Write a protein that binds this ligand. Structure first.
Ligand SMILES: Nc1ncnc2c1ncn2[C@@H]1O[C@H](COP(=O)(O)OP(=O)(O)OP(=O)(O)O)[C@H]2OC3(O[C@H]21)C([N+](=O)[O-])=CC(=[N+]([O-])O)C=C3[N+](=O)[O-]
Ligand SMILES: Nc1ncnc2c1ncn2[C@@H]1O[C@H](COP(=O)(O)OP(=O)(O)OP(=O)(O)O)[C@H]2OC3(O[C@H]21)C([N+](=O)[O-])=CC(=[N+]([O-])O)C=C3[N+](=O)[O-]
Ligand SMILES: Nc1ncnc2c1ncn2[C@@H]1O[C@H](COP(=O)(O)OP(=O)(O)OP(=O)(O)O)[C@H]2OC3(O[C@H]21)C([N+](=O)[O-])=CC(=[N+]([O-])O)C=C3[N+](=O)[O-]
Ligand SMILES: *[C@@H]1O[C@H](CO)[C@@H](O)[C@H](O)[C@H]1NC(C)=O
Ligand SMILES: *[C@@H]1O[C@H](CO)[C@@H](O)[C@H](O)[C@H]1NC(C)=O
Ligand SMILES: *[C@@H]1O[C@H](CO)[C@@H](O)[C@H](O)[C@H]1NC(C)=O
Lengths: 320, 320, 320
């Protein structure tokens, strides 16, 4: 009959483990998140890149983009010019150049003339925004590599609407001259971009040349009970784009700045901006004591394990 | 006896409660949402602010931004100038200004000289877009406070792909001259921004100074069965950022408008636009009768509670 | 006595079915996704529309927007002009035109005078960006209808962080000269926009006039076990806005390009750009064998079905 009370002890111990460890006495709710970011830093290389230059106006609620490398082509006007030298765009004679837009890779409608691109090579003439943008190989060191030293301030506000409870990842009074540390300052959400790529096992200088995608994962697992109150974030950092060269890594945005000359003709300045798009993913759950939950758990285990206790009871009776 | 059939009655009543109240006969599916917004309104304050002035192009699917307050600094050129005099940017001598150092408060790379801003205030000289933008105190009544009277038309379309059923938050014929009221017109998705912030227990005049974040929460709980058909939206409104002064509330975007002067050198106009970012959160579930589910429920409860019945009959028969 | 071991066989075959089909030996994990898109194509209509022209800078992680139809109003200056002829704006005499307080549909503050719009009709004078933008009905064939032939390259990388495993929807070495095929080339995520709308049962020519919303749904159901390895995406395509005359379909963005005249006064060019906003929705789950999961399943079925077996054993003895 020792085996019997061993089974009873196992059942009781399991019910208490489930109750306490899994907190079956509390209601759970998924958090509702709000993220805001503010960038600080300036790079002076052939131009002064403050935040207004290396950012685009942010209406998104979960991500933000920092420019790390730049290809700029200025004062381009709609006219005729040589195509950029592409396998299908290089020509020896006008017979190679078909009229109109031929493939999706062209920057303009082809006139059919084969015209010099540089001293050495010829290429198909096109009607386009001229001169066509032609580095195509981003600068050997990244232009805005200095962005490694920029800092980002991530204001994350979490809401449990049922519990009417709100938390943020900021200490009650925060000294700005702080840098995030897992143990010493967990409530300092100021991150050096280089440090972020560091925790993601990535080399900023290398990644900055062609861009990429970094996920800032903020996890909240919250107990709102007065006994054992824990509600604080856990950050992890991960690179989301395949780093391998053949698999098309990196990220860039294309944009233009349009101008009008005194004559009235429109002229534009075309940017291809490689950069890192940071995706801020905030998931989490929170729980709080509720009587209805405790009662339903008690009733549930009383029913189920009450049936188990009686069946095991009669089993030991009927056979011994 | 009495206690036995009391237990059987409790079991039967519970199976019925579960079946009907929890609708265990229907398959449930989580909705997939689509939001579009269109803003209407004009403010005449020193300039004519129509939608093209007080919004930025919205490619995001979950949110939209309305400008409420504005700081503009015009005709700034890349050169050297004094930093803006903010405490901890002030200096008496050149040793306080480190050379080539970008600090959290600085708008440019420091030259290392300490230079006059006023007669009275000296500050670290920097290479930056000059003059530096230095209000840091947004206009005392909000510039676009009148935006309180703008209206937003929120077109929400939800799909249940399994059920191949689609719903919108718009009445079958909608008069534009309607304005949302919780009870009188629930399917009028035209909202006065002031009314939204009112529903969020917030003062538009106050919030318009430094900006903020409002969540427009659209809840759908849908029964698609013909005998009890309910599928209509439920709106709630909540401010997501802590409004307290010390915890860094508000929201803004920085952007610039670039021009070129005749010599070709760049000059830009820098905007710091405080405003409200509205985040449209659409959550929801819908359910529809399915035979496979009803059969699974009947089979499940016959199995489990059939075993329970055999326990009570056989086992309590064994005794007495 | 045959019925008893028939019950045992049904239970056993069911345990095996659940184990194998539902893969109860696997830990399951929800997907973490990353999408990048790149647009390629050029349209020649009165101007050269390359990607910098028909797109807006995209910082969002789940969507992208292509312009299909355009209304442009150039050289708009703040001054007085007639309102656009909308029902509430047409007037025969000055008494209908109220001064100052405007309507939500007005483009500027009213002077209170009733002034000529055409030869034929008059309308209320306003202070606004003049001339007001007045087609209100987009061009009868869409101006950028040719975007049908543009291609989009959708780079999707999914991560299972617990299993430390990542996949992408791109073949291991991919030649760009591929076009997506459901069966022949499923790992070629290069789509012609026309073909996208085709798969969604939509006509690009038709949709291009007023725009709309297309959902590109990428589903991953992944088994990472070596003996049964499947991890590849399946795409579906759906139009999210109700295709119907009265229920307000279509999509557009408003933006402006500001210029300065030699005088220094502001001049702007106002765009209403109709287009298709494509939403890339990536959901999925993946699973991998884990010993703790298999053990918890073994223990659970031993517990539950051990009680069931003893119950029916006691029943068959005690009664027949
Ligand atoms: N990425 C970042 N890394 C580090 N710190 C950051 C970062 N982003 C923001 N901060 C700090 O956050 C403070 C509060 O900024 P916040 O109000 O949220 O947004 P803004 O900086 O746009 O200001 P605003 O809301 O418009 O008044 C800023 O004020 C100040 O320090 C700055 C500040 N400044 O930004 O210039 C100057 C200052 N003094 O004393 O000169 C004091 C601050 N402060 O105490 O927070
Ligand atoms: N924020 C808002 N608050 C209130 N109503 C809004 C708002 N946004 C849109 N509406 C109304 O919604 C009607 C349908 O808008 P819709 O046509 O989808 O708008 P878009 O700007 O996308 O234009 P489009 O359809 O592309 O030509 C509009 O037509 C009209 O009333 C407008 C309209 N208008 O100028 O937009 C004028 C009009 N009269 O009578 O002059 C009648 C309308 N109407 O009855 O719907
Ligand atoms: N929507 C699209 N439809 C079809 N193809 C697309 C699309 N988007 C991108 N591609 C192809 O993807 C190739 C790799 O581009 P990717 O690395 O993703 O981005 P970027 O082009 O910005 O990179 P980069 O800055 O050049 O390193 C591009 O190179 C090329 O073909 C282009 C390319 N080009 O973009 O100009 C020229 C070329 N030749 O031979 O001239 C060969 C390519 N190629 O083989 O992939
Ligand atoms: C001319 O252009 C072709 C195409 O890129 C290139 O291979 C060649 O090196 C260029 N020659 C000069 C003079 O730069
Ligand atoms: C100096 O400039 C700062 C700018 O905020 C101001 O606080 C101070 O009163 C000014 N004093 C004079 C004399 O300009
Ligand atoms: C006059 O303007 C109104 C637009 O409301 C239109 O009904 C009418 O046909 C126009 N007549 C012209 C263009 O002569």
């Amino acid at each position: 009959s020792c085996v019997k009370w061993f089974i009873y002890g196992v059942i009781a111990v399991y019910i208490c483990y489930t109750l306490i460890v899994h907190k079956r006495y509390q209601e759970k709710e998924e958090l509702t998140s709000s993220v805001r970011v503010t960038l600080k830093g300036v790079a002076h290389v052939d131009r002064i890149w403050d935040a207004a230059e290396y950012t685009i106006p942010t209406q998104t609620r979960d991500s933000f983009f920092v420019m790390t490398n730049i290809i700029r082509t200025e004062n381009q006007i709609q006219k005729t010019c040589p195509e950029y030298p592409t396998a299908k765009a290089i020509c020896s004679s006008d017979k190679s150049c078909a009229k109109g837009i031929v493939d999706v890779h062209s920057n303009g409608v082809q006139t059919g003339k084969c015209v010099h691109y540089n001293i050495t090579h010829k290429t198909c003439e096109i009607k386009a925004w001229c001169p066509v943008q032609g580095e195509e190989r981003p600068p050997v060191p990244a232009v805005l590599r200095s962005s490694e030293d920029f800092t980002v301030f991530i204001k994350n506000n979490i809401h449990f609407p049922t519990f009417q409870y709100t938390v943020q990842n900021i200490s009650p009074k925060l000294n700005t001259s702080c840098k995030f540390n897992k143990v010493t300052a967990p409530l300092c959400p100021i991150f050096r971009l280089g440090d972020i790529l560091q925790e993601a096992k990535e080399n900023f200088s290398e990644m900055a040349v062609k861009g990429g995608i970094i996920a800032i994962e903020i996890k909240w697992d919250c107990d709102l009970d007065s006994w054992s109150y824990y509600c604080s974030p856990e950050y992890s950092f991960r690179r989301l784009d395949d780093k391998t060269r053949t698999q098309y890594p990196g990220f860039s945005i294309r944009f233009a700045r349009h101008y009008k000359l005194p004559d009235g003709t429109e002229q534009r300045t075309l940017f291809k901006a490689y950069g890192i798009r940071f995706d801020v993913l905030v998931f989490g759950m929170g729980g709080q004591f509720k009587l209805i939950e405790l009662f339903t758990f008690i009733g549930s285990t009383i029913a189920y394990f009450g049936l188990a206790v009686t069946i095991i009871e009669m089993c030991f009776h009927l056979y011994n």
